[PDB]
Symmetry: C2
Protein backbone atom coordinates (compact mmCIF):
# COMPACT_ATOMS: atom_id res chain seq x y z
CA UNK A 1 0.00 0.00 0.00
CA UNK A 2 1.63 3.13 -1.36
CA UNK A 3 2.07 6.37 0.60
CA UNK A 4 0.48 9.16 -1.35
CA UNK A 5 0.85 12.91 -1.14
CA UNK A 6 -1.39 15.44 -2.93
CA UNK A 7 -0.10 18.99 -2.97
CA UNK A 8 -0.51 22.38 -4.58
CA UNK A 9 2.70 24.06 -3.40
CA UNK A 10 1.84 27.01 -1.20
CA UNK A 11 2.68 27.91 2.39
CA UNK A 12 -0.66 29.20 3.63
CA UNK A 13 -1.80 31.31 6.56
CA UNK A 14 -5.35 31.91 7.84
CA UNK A 15 -6.50 35.56 7.49
CA UNK A 16 -7.02 37.01 10.97
CA UNK A 17 -7.57 40.60 12.17
CA UNK A 18 -3.87 40.64 13.18
CA UNK A 19 -2.76 39.75 9.67
CA UNK A 20 -5.28 42.19 8.10
CA UNK A 21 -3.65 45.03 10.07
CA UNK A 22 -0.18 44.20 8.69
CA UNK A 23 -1.51 43.94 5.15
CA UNK A 24 -3.31 47.30 5.51
CA UNK A 25 -0.07 48.91 6.74
CA UNK A 26 1.88 47.75 3.67
CA UNK A 27 -0.90 48.19 1.09
CA UNK A 28 -3.19 51.01 2.33
CA UNK A 29 -5.02 51.39 -1.05
CA UNK A 30 -6.13 47.72 -1.28
CA UNK A 31 -10.39 41.45 2.58
CA UNK A 32 -11.17 40.22 6.09
CA UNK A 33 -11.49 36.47 5.40
CA UNK A 34 -9.57 33.84 3.42
CA UNK A 35 -6.21 32.10 3.09
CA UNK A 36 -3.04 34.15 2.66
CA UNK A 37 -0.32 32.84 0.32
CA UNK A 38 2.89 33.36 2.29
CA UNK A 39 5.07 31.43 -0.20
CA UNK A 40 4.77 29.53 -3.50
CA UNK A 41 6.99 26.50 -4.12
CA UNK A 42 8.92 26.72 -7.47
CA UNK A 43 8.00 23.46 -9.26
CA UNK A 44 4.38 23.20 -8.19
CA UNK A 45 0.79 23.36 -9.44
CA UNK A 46 0.46 26.82 -7.86
CA UNK A 47 3.60 28.18 -9.57
CA UNK A 48 2.62 26.70 -12.95
CA UNK A 49 -0.96 27.94 -12.55
CA UNK A 50 -0.10 31.59 -11.79
CA UNK A 51 -0.60 31.94 -8.05
CA UNK A 52 1.79 34.46 -6.43
CA UNK A 53 2.80 35.26 -2.87
CA UNK A 54 0.56 37.88 -1.29
CA UNK A 55 -2.51 36.36 -3.04
CA UNK A 56 -5.56 35.72 -0.86
CA UNK A 57 -7.56 32.58 -1.70
CA UNK A 58 -11.22 33.21 -0.87
CA UNK A 59 -13.16 30.31 -2.46
CA UNK A 60 -12.56 26.77 -3.68
CA UNK A 61 -15.02 25.24 -6.17
CA UNK A 62 -17.49 27.98 -5.16
CA UNK A 63 -17.20 27.41 -1.41
CA UNK A 64 -16.03 30.18 0.93
CA UNK A 65 -12.67 29.71 2.68
CA UNK A 66 -12.20 31.05 6.22
CA UNK A 67 -9.52 28.69 7.66
CA UNK A 68 -6.43 26.96 6.31
CA UNK A 69 -7.76 23.54 7.44
CA UNK A 70 -10.53 23.87 4.83
CA UNK A 71 -8.01 24.33 2.01
CA UNK A 72 -5.94 21.41 3.31
CA UNK A 73 -9.11 19.26 3.13
CA UNK A 74 -9.88 20.45 -0.44
CA UNK A 75 -6.34 19.63 -1.62
CA UNK A 76 -6.73 16.16 -0.11
CA UNK A 77 -10.14 15.48 -1.60
CA UNK A 78 -10.89 17.42 -4.80
CA UNK A 79 -9.19 17.68 -8.18
CA UNK A 80 -8.71 20.15 -9.78
CA UNK A 81 -9.43 23.13 -7.52
CA UNK A 82 -11.12 26.23 -8.95
CA UNK A 83 -9.52 28.85 -6.70
CA UNK A 84 -10.88 32.40 -6.43
CA UNK A 85 -8.08 34.80 -5.56
CA UNK A 86 -7.88 38.45 -4.54
CA UNK A 87 -4.71 40.15 -5.80
CA UNK A 88 -4.78 43.82 -4.83
CA UNK A 89 -7.83 45.23 -6.65
CA UNK A 90 -7.98 42.26 -9.03
CA UNK A 91 -10.31 39.23 -8.73
CA UNK A 92 -8.86 36.14 -10.41
CA UNK A 93 -9.86 32.51 -11.07
CA UNK A 94 -7.25 29.69 -11.30
CA UNK A 95 -7.69 25.97 -11.97
CA UNK A 96 -5.03 24.22 -9.97
CA UNK A 97 -4.78 20.44 -10.13
CA UNK A 98 -3.07 18.94 -7.05
CA UNK A 99 0.06 16.99 -8.02
CA UNK A 100 0.13 13.43 -6.72
CA UNK A 101 3.37 11.72 -5.61
CA UNK A 102 3.46 8.02 -4.81
CA UNK A 103 5.68 5.71 -2.79
CA UNK A 104 6.62 8.38 -0.24
CA UNK A 105 8.60 10.24 -2.91
CA UNK A 106 7.33 13.62 -1.64
CA UNK A 107 9.63 13.67 1.37
CA UNK A 108 8.98 16.60 3.67
CA UNK A 109 9.51 20.32 4.07
CA UNK A 110 12.01 21.50 6.64
Amino acid sequence: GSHMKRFIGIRMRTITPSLVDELKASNPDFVSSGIYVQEVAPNSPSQRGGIQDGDIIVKVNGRPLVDSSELQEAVLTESPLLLEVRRGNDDLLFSIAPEVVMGGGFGRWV
Copy 2:
Protein backbone atom coordinates in the same frame (compact mmCIF):
# COMPACT_ATOMS: atom_id res chain seq x y z
CA GLY B 1 3.57 31.08 25.08
CA SER B 2 4.42 31.69 21.44
CA HIS B 3 4.35 29.02 18.73
CA MET B 4 7.74 28.93 17.08
CA LYS B 5 8.90 27.49 13.79
CA ARG B 6 12.55 27.10 12.73
CA PHE B 7 13.10 26.31 9.08
CA ILE B 8 15.67 26.20 6.32
CA GLY B 9 13.39 25.90 3.29
CA ILE B 10 14.01 22.61 1.54
CA ARG B 11 11.81 19.64 0.72
CA MET B 12 14.09 16.75 1.62
CA ARG B 13 14.17 13.05 0.80
CA THR B 14 16.30 10.30 2.39
CA ILE B 15 18.83 8.74 -0.05
CA THR B 16 17.89 5.09 -0.60
CA PRO B 17 19.11 2.51 -3.14
CA SER B 18 15.88 3.18 -5.09
CA LEU B 19 16.63 6.88 -5.34
CA VAL B 20 20.34 6.23 -6.14
CA ASP B 21 19.24 4.19 -9.19
CA GLU B 22 17.13 7.07 -10.55
CA LEU B 23 19.93 9.56 -9.98
CA LYS B 24 22.43 7.24 -11.73
CA ALA B 25 20.07 6.96 -14.71
CA SER B 26 19.85 10.75 -15.15
CA ASN B 27 23.47 11.57 -14.26
CA PRO B 28 25.62 8.53 -15.21
CA ASP B 29 28.96 10.43 -14.88
CA PHE B 30 28.38 11.56 -11.25
CA VAL B 31 26.78 8.98 -3.30
CA SER B 32 24.91 6.21 -1.49
CA SER B 33 23.98 8.07 1.73
CA GLY B 34 22.59 11.50 2.64
CA ILE B 35 19.61 13.82 2.20
CA TYR B 36 18.39 14.70 -1.28
CA VAL B 37 17.15 18.25 -1.94
CA GLN B 38 13.95 17.75 -3.92
CA GLU B 39 12.93 21.44 -3.79
CA VAL B 40 14.19 24.78 -2.39
CA ALA B 41 11.66 27.34 -1.16
CA PRO B 42 12.19 30.83 -2.76
CA ASN B 43 12.51 33.17 0.26
CA SER B 44 14.44 30.89 2.58
CA PRO B 45 17.80 30.39 4.29
CA SER B 46 18.60 27.64 1.76
CA GLN B 47 17.81 29.83 -1.27
CA ARG B 48 19.78 32.79 0.14
CA GLY B 49 22.67 30.52 1.12
CA GLY B 50 23.13 28.85 -2.30
CA ILE B 51 21.58 25.42 -1.92
CA GLN B 52 19.99 24.11 -5.15
CA ASP B 53 17.63 21.27 -5.99
CA GLY B 54 19.48 18.05 -6.76
CA ASP B 55 22.03 18.80 -4.01
CA ILE B 56 22.80 15.99 -1.57
CA ILE B 57 23.42 17.04 2.04
CA VAL B 58 25.89 14.61 3.62
CA LYS B 59 26.97 16.23 6.92
CA VAL B 60 25.75 18.83 9.39
CA ASN B 61 28.27 20.46 11.76
CA GLY B 62 30.64 17.56 10.94
CA ARG B 63 28.14 14.79 11.65
CA PRO B 64 27.14 12.29 8.96
CA LEU B 65 23.54 12.40 7.69
CA VAL B 66 21.82 9.15 6.69
CA ASP B 67 18.11 9.95 7.34
CA SER B 68 15.89 13.00 6.92
CA SER B 69 14.82 12.81 10.61
CA GLU B 70 18.40 13.71 11.58
CA LEU B 71 18.31 16.91 9.52
CA GLN B 72 14.89 17.79 10.94
CA GLU B 73 16.41 17.45 14.45
CA ALA B 74 19.42 19.64 13.50
CA VAL B 75 17.15 22.38 12.11
CA LEU B 76 15.18 22.28 15.36
CA THR B 77 18.20 22.37 17.65
CA GLU B 78 21.30 23.98 16.11
CA SER B 79 22.02 27.38 14.60
CA PRO B 80 23.57 27.97 12.12
CA LEU B 81 24.08 24.67 10.29
CA LEU B 82 27.37 24.00 8.50
CA LEU B 83 26.06 21.80 5.69
CA GLU B 84 28.36 19.66 3.52
CA VAL B 85 26.83 19.19 0.08
CA ARG B 86 27.63 17.04 -2.94
CA ARG B 87 26.71 18.76 -6.23
CA GLY B 88 27.75 16.53 -9.13
CA ASN B 89 31.54 16.25 -8.82
CA ASP B 90 31.74 19.29 -6.52
CA ASP B 91 32.02 19.22 -2.70
CA LEU B 92 30.61 22.38 -1.12
CA LEU B 93 30.21 23.90 2.37
CA PHE B 94 27.28 26.22 3.26
CA SER B 95 26.43 28.01 6.51
CA ILE B 96 22.68 28.10 6.71
CA ALA B 97 21.03 29.77 9.69
CA PRO B 98 17.48 28.49 10.32
CA GLU B 99 14.93 31.32 10.11
CA VAL B 100 12.70 31.62 13.17
CA VAL B 101 9.03 32.68 12.92
CA MET B 102 6.99 33.46 16.02
CA GLY B 103 3.32 33.57 16.93
CA GLY B 104 2.34 30.84 14.47
CA GLY B 105 3.13 33.16 11.56
CA PHE B 106 4.75 30.30 9.59
CA GLY B 107 1.45 28.73 8.61
CA ARG B 108 1.87 25.45 6.77
CA TRP B 109 2.79 23.93 3.44
CA VAL B 110 0.04 22.38 1.36
